[PDB]
Design a protein around this ligand. Structure first.
Ligand SMILES: [Co+2]
Lengths: 86, 85, 86
């Protein structure tokens, strides 16, 4: 048959001009960043995510997330605390 | 919304100008949105099946994993005709 | 299939300053790259991958890949090919 198929939602990783690494985390519905040096994982203040699939970071440090399960793209303008929906 | 009509987005990339590129997996297409734009453009890729990853180089060429077709395609800036890698 | 070959359900793509294209060849548990105007794909020396997904590359040529679904991020250091878990 193959009556049931499903796709695995993608996992994203991105690295900014300074080597800081940004990762989607499906199980905790969050996006985290890891500055190399400090042994600290920062949870970024995105909200209400459902299975973030992709992350990118522009020159200005702005972070963008494909929020797969909510059919949208969210961003966090660098040192803004409020998420915009694109 | 400002991106409009997305279904199950798989991937996002951002170019040096802050233009945002998105794989719209559920609709088999790739869309883009300039930094702080109202309007979105659909890129002229063709015959995609569940596009997934997207990247953009410093020349503005857009690369996409055509996950359902096991291939990678690319589109030069302002081109209408993709190349398969 | 022109120059990439034998891909199965690929996920992430990334491109470096040299225009080298990196593809997470998800279905084959490997990461492949294609140098500008080369006709030969290179399988990077990651080991122990399983359903990898996202891929990024920094200016230094370090490659990061999401791996074992949600479990981890693997970093391949340029030159040494030392693999570390982020
Ligand atoms: Co989807």
């Amino acid at each position: 048959s193959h009556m049931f198929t499903g796709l695995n939602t993608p996992h994203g990783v991105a690295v900014d001009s300074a080597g800081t690494v940004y990762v989607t985390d499906h199980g905790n519905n969050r996006v985290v960043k890891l500055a190399a040096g400090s042994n600290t994982q920062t949870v970024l203040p995105f909200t209400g995510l459902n299975t973030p699939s992709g992350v990118a970071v522009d020159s200005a440090g702005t972070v963008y997330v494909t929020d797969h399960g909510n059919n949208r793209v969210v961003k966090l303008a660098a040192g803004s605390n409020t998420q915009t929906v694109l």
